[PDB]
Design a protein around this ligand. Structure first.
Ligand code: FMN
Ligand code: FMN
Lengths: 106, 103
């Protein structure tokens, strides 16, 4: 169904966990993405304005939803319905980010 | 630093990921918690009414916070400042649960 990406909150948000659906959608195994920023999913037809909105939202730890053009490991484009939210503790500290991916290419 | 627990949405919400602080707080390594329901952290003096509120919130995929008595691997009791929220896709399907153990 829907992919899930968990990243660290700091140091440019390296991936720390992906679910099985993430591999189904993107063609990447966990081994191939752990420790990397998720921006490797982008490529030349990705909308720069959309990437800028993601960058500013993540810097502010503000939830954001975007439809963004991404690329499978072998280079096949797909439309990623992407929702990112910070994970906060009760003091308001950001512990992680969680991203949900749906392939909406259909 | 605050602990984080990620579980699957269905079956019995098995743990699929914990952060470093989870191990600092609880004394459990990832290998000894992955695939288990987090209820193993509970013990003799855990408040049953608190557990029942968590049970109903998870069943309905509702956000909840509880201060719950838990036990470290070595059996020492500690107060877990626990907050749980569902992770949803845009069609409203629950993909996972995320728990935070606030430091
Ligand atoms: C939890 C999380 C999941 C993300 N998932 C994706 C994704 O699936 N596709 C994507 O293009 N970018 C994703 N990103 C965004 C990139 O990692 C990055 O934040 C974005 O490209 C903007 O920053 P940049 O301009 O430094 O690349 C995700 C970010 C986070 C924090
Ligand atoms: C993501 C997540 C994290 C959880 N973390 C804890 C925890 O740290 N301590 C705890 O006692 N219960 C925790 N729980 C709750 C138990 O897993 C379980 O839902 C609760 O005991 C109520 O269900 P039960 O009556 O079937 O045990 C967590 C649940 C979820 C979904």
């Amino acid at each position: 169904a829907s992919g899930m990406i968990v990243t660290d909150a700091g140091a440019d948000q390296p991936i720390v966990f992906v679910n099985r659906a993430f591999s189904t959608i993107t063609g990447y195994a966990p081994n191939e993405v752990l420790g990397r920023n998720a921006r490797f999913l982008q490529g030349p037809q990705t909308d720069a304005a959309t990437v800028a909105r993601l960058r500013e939202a993540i810097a502010a730890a503000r939830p954001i939803q975007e439809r963004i053009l991404n690329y499978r490991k072998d280079g096949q484009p797909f439309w990623n319905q992407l929702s990112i939210s910070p994970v906060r503790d009760e003091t308001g500290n950001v512990v992680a980010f969680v991203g949900v991916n749906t392939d909406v290419t259909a």
